[PDB]
């Protein structure tokens, strides 16, 4: 565990009446303030796989590099899935879970069928719920699900040259910056259903990645089994500083 | 940890305390110092 | 099941708008994100319907390439267009446009086109033979999406 | 006929619980995968004419 | 375990070695005191009892 100190909020002075110019109230009231603290931790992710001693000969070509690369890519896939929408049970809490538990999950008007698509205006409206941290565009990151991107490609507000410069969809067929926000597409969002999410905006500077040990590979020889066991492990987590900086747009009910 | 044969006394010895103090975003001040000042030497 | 039943009517009540064609890219999924790896093919009737699009007439609508000024539709929604006349006849549930992931498809070949000439003196004929051995195959079971008329 | 090998999909590791830290489950689960093959072939196109 | 040495400010190996050695010493002295004959050396108390 790692613990840091958090500086408290702000007090205020007082206006003293002219009558108290000689009494003890000429110095006003007393300001008070108490510090706080925050904690960090990690979780362990691991996978294993074995190769017997009969197959390397029993093949025209080797099968080891495939095993190693599959282990590595499984690790990466699991990490990305958990960071996206992981829970708190033995795994890092995903961005979507943080937004839901912060009451920053906005229920939009887009339907789960297609009666109402996802518009640029709906995405830009989320900046309101970020409060103070939404005032700077350079400190924000926007991630949208694939279906949301294809819906944006058909948005009626980015069609003509008169509307949006020369970056109109009809001339390009792709959407870059939106309402001043760069677009990054992700495929790991939950399924398209009622009450599910399609976009998220994150105050990038508010998120850290605690790590105890990096990716390690431990190979073991089992003579009594004539196998070679491979073990891959690491300890990571996803934690933030203060309960803010995440807002996620959801589908209607 | 409570997983191996030997254990530590408590989480106080599993923890690192940092003397780093960090603060959130504070509201910017605007009206405090935008007007000219008129010094006085009497009531 | 990459046959999108669009709302265009074969009878001609509703034309085949550009947005209808561009909506087909959604079904391509992961392969539809990058534009430079796609090819679009349309029927002649689909092309003429494209020429009558309300959405490509004004200069303020689409740059300099408005139909009112040129009369040929080139790139559509960032996709270059190609017209082919070998689509089926215009009717209900028939295809008018095809979008294909280019690199997913290959053309195996055993022997090229060859010509063999035979003199048959027992019949006083010269027989000409033309032969070739090819096929059209794709790597993975995806990469092509086509739209069809309604009804 | 020409035969080509197809690499399989991706697996996923596991988040090991703190309780199973000292046991064998600390190594996580096992990830498996079998290769696959695809075949190509051809057809013959021919035509003739006489004079 | 390997996830305890990192999960601590200070090492815990010398304690382990010392505890093992002193366990041996305590067990042997106790057995020689009053260890029974079943799989253990006979203790002086047991020897005096049987005699």
Numbering used by the authors:
A (entry chain F): 205 to 457
B (entry chain E): 162 to 204
C (entry chain A): 307 to 457
D (entry chain A): 205 to 255
E (entry chain H): 256 to 306
Paper text:
The T5 family of viruses are tailed bacteriophages characterized by a long non-contractile tail. The bacteriophage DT57C is closely related to the paradigmal T5 phage, though it recognizes a different receptor (BtuB) and features highly divergent lateral tail fibers (LTF). We present a composite map determined by electron cryo-microscopy (cryo-EM) at resolutions ranging between 2.9 Å to 4.9 Å of the entire T5-like phage particle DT57C, and atomic models comprising its core structural proteins. Our results provide a complete atomic structure of a T5-like phage, provide insights into the process of DNA ejection as well as a structural basis for the design of engineered phages and future mechanistic studies.
Facilitated by the icosahedral symmetry of the capsid, it was reconstructed at 2.9 Å resolution. Although one of the vertices of the capsid is occupied by the portal complex, icosahedral symmetry was applied to maximize resolution. Consistent with structures of the closely related T5 phage, the T = 13 icosahedral capsid of mature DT57C was composed of two proteins, the major capsid protein (MCP) and the head decorating protein (DCP), and it had a diameter of 930 nm. The asymmetric unit comprises 13 copies of the MCP lacking the Δ-domain (the first 160 N-terminal residues, which is cleaved during the maturation process of the capsid). While one of them is located at an icosahedral vertex and contributes to the formation of pentamers, the remaining 12 form two consecutive proximal and distal hexamers. We observed clear additional map features located at the center of each hexamer, corresponding to the decoration protein. The strongest part of the electron potential map was found at the binding pocket in the center of each hexamer, corresponding to the N-terminal domain. The center of both hexamers, located below the map feature corresponding to the N-terminal domain of DCP, was predicted to be highly negatively charged. Based on the highly negative electrostatic potential at the center of both hexamers, it is likely that the DCP binds to it through such positively charged regions.
